[PDB]
């Protein structure tokens, strides 16, 4: 019985729309406001998803929140890359059904470079022939891939929970074929982190200058970006990497 995989498939968030008006000509303010609102909508789903993961409540309740808050960006990028792979074969970024980015929107959003990398991430799902099951366990493992340098309140329970998720990834892979596969997947998991960092910087700078540019940041978005993201950007909170960068 595939108990672990059953849980992941069962708790996997459905479609989330951004509420973007696609009848109005593209503007930087409207495009970035819709992404932020999508971020907010998505956060809600990421919280409910993470809280339903196997063993997640073994974590200290305060570590539960931190982990979600540090990981959210990378979790969203990775899932978005998947959506883009399965819906449009990575030809465009499928943020939401009502928010698909072509190259014009990539350019109008002033985050073309970040978009380029995200789309490259999406292409990798196709290049490496990632299975939905690999995707599911990789995404779960992403939640436990970023922690403070000073450690969590109960680090031991995190370490065990992360160890078990790596073991689960091992299992859906399962000797030279497996060692090759594990190498490829962990390299893929590592590649999400520099991308998330670029989006962390962009979203942070944007929050600071938000009033100047008429870009709206929803309550939960503005809080994380100003309280938790600077902890990452200042080097206090760091990715866990499989390979040396
Ligand atoms: C909505 N979204 C996804 C998804 N799905 C990945 C990255 C972002 C994002 C980008 C810039 C920003 O200012 C706010 C954001 F929420």
The label of the residue with tokens 């305060």 reads 62
The label of the residue with tokens 């060692």 reads 179
88 vs 158: CA distance, rounded Å: 36
Tell me: is residue 117 an annotated ligand-binding position: no
Helix axes 219-227, 28-51, angle to 10 degrees: 80
Closest protein CA for atom 16 of ligand 1:
39
Ligand 1 test: best mutation among 39, 73, 216, most atoms within 8 Å of CB?
39
C-alpha 160 – ligand 1 centre gap (Å):
30
121 vs 195: CA distance, rounded Å: 9
From 110, 63, 69, 42, select the one nearest 230 (Cα to Cα).
69
C-alpha 68 – ligand 1 centre gap (Å):
15
- Other CB atoms within 10 A of residue 132 CB: 13
What is the structure's resolution, reported in angstroms to one decimal? 2.3
Give the single-character DSSP code of 174.
-
* Structure method: X-ray
C-alpha 42 – ligand 1 centre gap (Å):
9
For residue 77, the ligand 1 atom closest to its alpha carbon is 6
Contact in structure between 97 and 18 (CB atoms under 8 Å): no
Residue 93 pairs in a beta bridge with 101
Cα separations in angstroms, 73 against 27, 36, 178, 215: 23, 11, 29, 19
For the chain, which domains are there? Answer: 1-245 (1.10.565.10)
Contact in structure between 147 and 156 (CB atoms under 8 Å): no
Q: Distance from CA of residue 138 to its chain's centroid?
A: 11
Q: Name the phi and psi angles at 25, rounded to 5.
A: -45, 145
């Amino acid at each position: 019985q595939p108990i672990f995989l059953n849980v992941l498939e069962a708790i996997e968030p459905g479609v989330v729309c951004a509420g973007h008006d696609n009848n109005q000509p593209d503007s930087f303010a409207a495009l970035l406001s819709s992404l932020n609102e999508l971020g907010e909508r998505q956060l809600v789903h990421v919280v409910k998803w993470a809280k339903a993961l196997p063993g997640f409540r073994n974590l200290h309740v305060d570590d539960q929140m931190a982990v979600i808050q540090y990981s959210w960006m990378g979790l969203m990028v990775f899932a978005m890359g998947w959506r883009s792979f399965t819906n449009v074969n990575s030809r465009m970024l499928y943020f939401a059904p009502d928010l698909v980015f072509n190259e014009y929107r990539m350019h109008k959003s002033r985050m073309y470079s970040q978009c380029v990398r995200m789309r490259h991430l999406s292409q990798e799902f196709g290049w490496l022939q990632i299975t939905p099951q690999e995707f599911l366990c990789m995404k779960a493992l992403l939640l436990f891939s970023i922690i403070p340098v000073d450690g969590l309140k109960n680090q031991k329970f995190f370490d065990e929970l992360r160890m078990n998720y790596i073991k689960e990834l091992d299992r859906i892979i399962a000797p030279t074929s497996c060692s090759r596969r594990f190498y490829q997947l962990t390299k893929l998991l590592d590649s999400v982190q520099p991308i998330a960092r670029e989006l962390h910087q962009f979203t942070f700078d944007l929050l600071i200058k938000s009033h100047m540019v008429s870009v709206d940041f929803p309550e939960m978005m503005a809080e994380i970006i100003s309280v938790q993201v600077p902890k990452i950007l200042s080097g206090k909170v760091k990715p866990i990497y499989f390979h040396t960068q």
